[PDB]
Amino acid sequence: ITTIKEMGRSIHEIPR
Amino acid sequence: TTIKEMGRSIHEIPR
Amino acid sequence: TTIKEMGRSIHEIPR
Amino acid sequence: ITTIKEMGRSIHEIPR
Amino acid sequence: TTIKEMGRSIHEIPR
Amino acid sequence: ITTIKEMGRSIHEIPR
Amino acid sequence: GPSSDLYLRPDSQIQFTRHASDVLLNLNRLRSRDILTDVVIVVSREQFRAHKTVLMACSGLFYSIFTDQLKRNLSVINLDPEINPEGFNILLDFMYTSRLNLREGNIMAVMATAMYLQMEHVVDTCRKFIKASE
Amino acid sequence: GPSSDLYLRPDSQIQFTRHASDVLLNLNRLRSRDILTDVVIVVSREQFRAHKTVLMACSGLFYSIFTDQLKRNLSVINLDPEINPEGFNILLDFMYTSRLNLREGNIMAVMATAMYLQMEHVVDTCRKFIKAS
Amino acid sequence: SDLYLRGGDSQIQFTRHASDVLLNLNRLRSRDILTDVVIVVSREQFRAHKTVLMACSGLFYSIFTDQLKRNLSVINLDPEINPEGFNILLDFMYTSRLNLREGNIMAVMATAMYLQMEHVVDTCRKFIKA
Amino acid sequence: SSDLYLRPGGGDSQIQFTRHASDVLLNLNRLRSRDILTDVVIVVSREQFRAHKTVLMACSGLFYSIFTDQLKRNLSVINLDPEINPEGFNILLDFMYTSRLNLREGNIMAVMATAMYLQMEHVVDTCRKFI
Amino acid sequence: SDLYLRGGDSQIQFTRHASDVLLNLNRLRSRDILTDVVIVVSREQFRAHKTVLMACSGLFYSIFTDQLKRNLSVINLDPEINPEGFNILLDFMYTSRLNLREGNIMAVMATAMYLQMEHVVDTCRKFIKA
Amino acid sequence: GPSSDLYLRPGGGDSQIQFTRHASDVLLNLNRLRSRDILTDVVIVVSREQFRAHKTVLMACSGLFYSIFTDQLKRNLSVINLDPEINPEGFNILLDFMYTSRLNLREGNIMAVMATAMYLQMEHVVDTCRKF
């Protein structure tokens, strides 16, 4: 299986 | 003073 | 209430 | 080697 | 403020 | 007895 | 000198660099053992057991639903009939593992599901992935 | 040729290398807003809110509590009086941030708390830390 | 005729000798005979024999093998160490008996880690799990 | 609520380390053999033995008597009576630090006589049976 | 001819020798060289040389001349004794200087009486009368 | 007016009393301790003749003894054998000097004190001897 690495934020950031 | 620990941090719940 | 521990109790100073 | 187990007190008992 | 004391300072251990 | 007064330092000074 | 002081002499902070991954693996193990799961998501009659906290952590949709104080005690949620059960299962595994598994033939399903769940960073990564194809 | 096929041509896997950190940060934000926190830990004078799921993930103690059949729907837990609230606070922040903050004056408290919570990997890291001092 | 005592190369094993020795060391300690160190744990003082401390504790083993600090007779433990925990471990060293009460269990356990008595710590870990 | 107490009923627990005393003696012998913290040398016919005073007092009425006198307590070299056999003494010293008494034909009487001199009657009684 | 030097028995007197010795003893103390006792004054610790303590204090003289008290390395003073007063007197023993401040004069004076330093007490009585 | 506030030292300054013969008093008591064999911790052996002393007094006065006892290995020695070339009487004169401030030179031993003091690395004594 061709694996690819994504290094950016994966999900929304719930705010303070 | 910050120190980086790279080993497992908590118990591993088994399957 | 007593419990018996039978393993080595302290470090072993080396030869 | 002939080994023998002695089970009585081995030394004088220092008193309190 | 300093002042000078000139008498024996301590007990004399005997011979 | 002939006594003489020496007034200089008598011994080495142990340093701090 | 006749004495000595046995003193712990460092204010330090230890940073456990794989702690977050270790946690997610344990959250996933809880899910697979059905330990402390508190919602069932149902997609075209298929049932998926989950932790609400992990759902709001990853998805704008579930974040919006469960930050509603009245809807916070729901235990069964049926997604919109348009949603593909397979797409949802792929995104749920992503939430609990960091892996997004795509077969030739399901990218559009996964993307659409991710758009519905409002997982925009995933959608963007799917957009790049598509363009690596067509 | 009059035709062409616009087909998505990849069996691939995308690995999001900071997703686990992103999740943990969001769990921390939810905790800081009392969102879905479902246990209150009472440590002498002080009360702490947490997600049972995060506590079971990190602490063998809580894992045993909450997989205990009778004890699973508990909503308030009183720790042993011996436990220091400041020590527990440091370990709770560790669970949600990966950062373990040690001050001169609390190392023993942190370690003892972690032994109580059965956080053996932390105890081991504390042992290493103590030995370097 | 020749009367010879054997040639069986024999060994006699006194199965309670070590236990006897330890009790006598405890008697010497309580009668303050030949104790040569004072351990200070938050202003509180404990007299003991260095050799027994080095035998049981890696921490003390390391102090008293330091070649330069050969004449130490006073050791000040870190201010965090609990005097009651230390006293239970000191009795343990001299008696093989570790006494735990509700209210001091964690103190004994953490003090034992500071003293580098890992086998005691492990026994405590087993203890608080059941 | 629920209250997590390590030993709820204000209990009284004791752990007994059944091999602790044996572990200590072995470490004492390790210290002895590496000359760590030994504080007396026993001299038996121009032969020298290093030991810990505390271990000697625990095992021997003779040494217990010497070192309970304050004047004699800070002695660091003790010359045993010239009649005492170095080999017999070395066997009894090893016994003190190991619980094991080694007898070969040719030293049994030596160990025995050394044991009375050191006033180790339990060892003497065990030696007497051994014949 | 016979060259024989000098003949009278001559004596050279080094007028600052004792002061020199005392300064070197103080340097040894501050470098923690050969200090062999710890004085404990309501939980505070002071390291010193027994010989200097016996030279200056009747109290310490009697402790360290006791046949039984041969291995003492830790002395606990009476709980009433003031740590600051004692430290001023210890500095005095090693330096010949007695430093008195408003707020500690009576402590120095009464501690000096406890330590049986009667000549220092008399000098403090002269001081307090001025 | 009707009240008064008593202060032992009003100008909360800083008073110091200097005991001008204290150091001499200390040394005399040290010599008394030595002659009564109280708390001596080293014996110096000079051609089978023995002298008891306090290590601190030796280190205070002699660069040799300072060097020996600043070695941790040699710090708990309790018997030190000086070189056989050193004269027992010359050594005894320097020991008394250490404990009394007074160096006694008689016809027949001045050279002995001289060599001994150089051996002990007591240069101030050596120079004062050379003038003599």
Residue numbers in the entry:
A (entry chain D), D (entry chain H), F (entry chain L): 1341 to 1356
B (entry chain C), C (entry chain G), E (entry chain K): 1342 to 1356
G (entry chain B): -7 to 2, 6 to 129
H (entry chain A): -7 to 2, 6 to 128
I (entry chain E), K (entry chain I): -4 to 1, 4 to 127
J (entry chain F): -5 to 125
L (entry chain J): -7 to 124
Published text:
We next attempted to increase the affinity between the back-to-back associations of BTB domains in the lattice, with the intention of creating indefinitely long filaments that would form a scaffold for the recruitment of guest proteins. Such an extension might also allow flexibility and versatility in lattice assembly. We therefore introduced two additional glycine residues between the NCoR1BBD2 sequence and the BTB domain within the NCoR1BBD2-BCL6BTB chimera, with the rationale being to extend the interface with the HP region. Thus, upon crystallization in the presence of the high-affinity NCoR1BBD1 peptide, the two chimeric BTB domains each assembled into filaments that formed open lattices. This system might therefore be used to accommodate a guest protein that is recruited to the BTB domain via its genetic fusion to the NCoR1BBD1 sequence.
We showed that these can mediate the formation of a variety of highly porous lattices, and that a guest protein may be incorporated into a BTB-domain lattice by its genetic fusion to a corepressor peptide that binds to the lateral groove of the BTB domain with high affinity. We have shown that the surface of the BCL6 BTB domain contains versatile interaction interfaces with the potential to mediate diverse lattices in a range of crystallization conditions.
